[PDB]
């Protein structure tokens, strides 16, 4: 049993359903630790396909990173062992396909999380927002890279620079989503595809997913470039704007950014 998720397996498909709606499935450490334990427990030969979903009728799929657990005092908010960074690596390395089945609105880290999964099938009423510029967060290289494998650079830069929600219809048009269906068809459509996948060769699926993962990561740079970017990110998470971003969220007001 898990406190923050509910797992149902039928035949060779496991459905991991979020159970943290009192905090709109915000990516708190306790919630992510349960999701990763549930996935680890499902890493067995008789499980062939995973679905991630919010409960039926959710208005909010996930409110993204828990803003209360973002560090304020000059620590990197997206370091390698941050729970969001851990879950995306775990999904990408997991030797089974993982389908995000989306009903409701997706925000920030949660958008990265579904982008790191293998397929996204969404309700026609679902919406998607990438939010670091609303909070002054210097999103990390790995995290940004996870957002660049589906839609083109211009579309990705519109999403990030505006932080404006896009519809499921537009997310489908630009290459982010596999399918958009009416919400009443969402479970049936997704289960049919997951059950179809689970009849295919799991060892071929596992090595092809791993090859894609390696190819997707194989954008290489020298140590000086990385260290230069890390200096840039530190200046951002050291900024008054980053403090203003978090303060504005806690005070339920609009941030006033000034460029320091």
């Amino acid at each position: 049993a898990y406190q923050y998720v509910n797992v149902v397996t039928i035949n060779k498909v496991a459905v991991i359903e979020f159970n943290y709606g009192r905090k709109l499935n915000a990516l708190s450490k306790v919630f992510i630790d349960d999701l990763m334990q549930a996935l680890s427990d499902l890493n067995r030969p008789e499980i062939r396909c995973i679905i991630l979903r919010a409960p039926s009728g959710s208005k909010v799929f996930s409110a993204g990173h828990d803003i209360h657990e973002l560090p304020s005092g000059g620590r990197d908010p997206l370091s390698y062992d941050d729970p969001l960074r851990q879950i995306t690596r775990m999904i990408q390395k997991f030797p089974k396909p993982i389908i995000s089945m989306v009903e409701g609105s997706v925000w920030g880290g949660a958008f990265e999380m579904i982008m790191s999964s293998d397929l996204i099938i969404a309700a026609s009423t679902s919406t998607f927002s990438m939010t670091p510029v609303n909070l002054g967060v210097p999103y990390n290289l790995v995290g940004i890279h996870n957002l660049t494998r589906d839609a083109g650079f211009h579309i990705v830069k519109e999403l990030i620079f505006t932080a404006s929600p896009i519809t499921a219809q537009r997310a489908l048009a630009v290459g982010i989503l596999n399918h958009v269906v009416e919400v009443e068809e969402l479970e049936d459509f997704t289960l049919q595809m997951a059950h179809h996948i689970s009849e295919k060769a799991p060892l071929a699926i596992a090595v092809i997913k791993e090859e894609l993962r390696v190819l997707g990561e194989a954008h290489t740079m020298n140590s000086d470039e990385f260290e230069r970017i890390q200096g840039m990110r530190r200046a951002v998470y050291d900024s008054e704007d980053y403090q203003e971003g978090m303060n504005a969220f806690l005070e339920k007001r609009k941030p006033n950014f000034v460029g320091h």
Copy 2:
């Protein structure tokens, strides 16, 4: 002049038509050797554009890799000098544009072969399937790479994990195809484009093609990562599942995959 292809030259355009209908243009060594000889013979200054096609009216453009020529004995089925691996390198290195003009259904290795070409123009009734997970084949890094330059990761993973065929309409929408034409207009439309390209500067075309080839390939990794992937692939082509997939196809039954 070739047993398994028919070549016609119209000014600066060459059309290479498959002549292997008795095996549905399966990528047999003897067929691919003739296709490569024909291309090589056309590597002449006065030829400016190639069209690859199946004969007019074909139900099957190509049934993909010849399953009777796939190694079953714990050997790599997709090594460097396998015919499919040879023809994709030749298409990509060829200093003239190669247009795949598709009528009929496209399967597995033949889908990778058209994806390796420069442009795809397809009949509205054409369909496309990527099939390794039907057979338990550990598709190789270069082969997978060749499928990732048009549609996004989520789309590619849907194609490979489901092995389900997609329509020409969907293949256009996700960026795999350039154009979708009624079958009665396919030949005329493709030849008009091939003649237009043939009026352009062939040395500029060749160097830009080669720049795109080398940029497309420039996802670099260290030796350890490659050797780790090669170890995973060998575990797959040594598996019971790989034997079962080949056997089930030849015996025309549904395979029973067990995860070893």
Copy 3:
């Protein structure tokens, strides 16, 4: 303050309008030097977003590289410190979003210039052509790379190999454009998006833009590959065809290309 551009500021948005209509905003050194000076002058904490535009009603957004300023052969026409190469690096390194607001037709180096910008919003009547194969120009690796981050390989190869114009509608479909709007709505639509972006966290925008630039450049190759390409490009700019392409344009006739 500038001979070949007009700059207006509206709150935190700066609009840089071309003023070179006499040469259809061809990318002459004098024009590019003025655009770069205006952009450098606007790198200020009270400026949050830039719009690049041609004057209202323009039939031609930009006719591309000034053909009178291309070297006659034996000289690389797209060397590192060529004005087009300088402006694309400056746009990509600029720590504020740059939106290309396109009315009219876009040609050759001007197409690369808008692709190098962060967002493109276009009139429904605007058209886009990539033209090196009309002139026999061996486009450089960096320049070609700048054309590969929005649309897929097959689409980019059609654009370059045909040099045929595409509509705003098709450029939207294939991922080149962010939005297409009626020309009467273009300025208000673009200004509202720029104003919106101007309220977001500028340091988070600048570091994410830079992360995207670095990830976009991170296709790496060895020195031999680069020098092999440079040798191919030099064979093209040494060619009879290159001189013929230049001569044909100046003499207003169809080039006769022969493959040397």
Copy 4:
């Protein structure tokens, strides 16, 4: 206890001594598994430095790969999970320095093994040979890479192409060894160096060792280059010469290599 090694601890220094003299410490699977378990058991905070050694007075430090365990099929003798490949990775990733203390002759895979360690301290009578060209073995990329971080390319090529032994004195002159000492002083010289290291900051040692490991691995290539090398290696392990090399070694005669 271990069947094939003896472990002694002297405060923070652990000495792992081969106990496989019957087979001249040949790198059999059972010997390497014991070595790796002994290392794993020593990965504790109270141990700060590891010495690997043969027993005092050994004429042969290690005879290299067990030739009876080399695949002579059309199978890769140095695949990712072969014991030699496993222990070099484990030595390199081990978060404490590992010092090879060499008395006796070193051969083949045993030479790669001490080269993968952090320091080599040797008796003045010790000798070193790299032997794959005596058997016709296609040594793997990672394995060769492990021989290239100490001596220069001309020296490495002499060692490999001749398979001739070099002295401790020449191995020191070309950068392979840290120190050469008279055999009576070897143990004490090596222990004092390990005790000295063990007084230093272990978390600093571990992260600098890991930084060196990843910089040492960071020679990157594309998938096509790797698969082309793999194809060449397979042609070597499928060769008559490879058979002849193995048979000649076992039958204690000179091989007759013919180049297929």
Copy 5:
């Protein structure tokens, strides 16, 4: 002129002499700022070669990083804009040769500084230590890479893991130094070589130096690898050991490291 350096120009050679003897030429910000200003001021066409030196007769060339300016309490001590990180980039990017002419003892960051220079000529009584493991410092990737281009991996690991001084004789034998001379001959030898270099083609020298700099940096890795290393570095600069190393240095006592 400069508070913390003295500059003497002889024909086309400039000799930059350290004038921070109060702190044995420790790399304080005020000293490095004057060193970089003096170097910048010498970037003129009539200057062809630079010598860096301590005053004639110095016991200590440089005592390394200023320990009072190294961050405690969980900031990275070797961030991109730390003085040491700035001076090594500036030395490597300087378009003239920079010769380190060493008299006295060289410590830690000052050893990286001279290794980042083009040639090192040393007195026979000079000595060289690399000290991070004495303090528990997690030396950064760029800094470690700067130590790997002269001696082999085994030698570099001995230097770093022991933090023991080596003699000029040993530094010459392992490839760190160009020449070792008697202290009375140091100025004559160095100036003769610098004057000889100053006769040569300065633009050829500049471009070849920059080629070597780029080739030297061209060990590339993916974002995940870099972020993983950064996480490990943070765990060290967050450690109790790091605090102990700093406190022990300030209190002039032996550190007691415990591995957390």
Copy 6:
């Protein structure tokens, strides 16, 4: 037979002896065409090792690139198809070991040529110098890389920045040479080593040589860094100093370089 080389076969070893003493074996196009023809003619199974040599008693092993065949200004002097660039690629890709057996003085491109070979055995009276800074030549990235795999950076920079000859003794100590012998012993010492190598497994030798070549080349950079370097080289081959260097050689006088 060849106009400009003489070939003798001794069992499985082939000796290619320069015959261009009239221009001191300067690497003229026609000399290099014969060297490459002779290597190609010896690429047969019954040849196992190549020796390159000057005739017995030569004072000059090779005077380097033919200065008369360098372009006059405004053209890359070391383009991919230059004969020096061709012969180093051919030596490095040749599937048999190539031993440079050196008697006399070695200059410039000829120093790079022997560095590109597998082993170097030299007379005790032989000397070595790298000369581009004597002439104002912007050496290319591949050519510089070929000089970095034996001696460390400081040594390579001393060699290039001074253009000063070094002795065989010093070339041995820094790792450039394999062996130094008295000139009377040179021929038979080198032949004994070639005959020894010729008894080893040639397919193993070939694949290990190719693995070393690929790993040697695997320092990767992005397109921007390469084009930046090419722009810097072009400024040097466009410079007044490049013309002064070529004219000073032609007029047998000391160049006056001014840094433009």
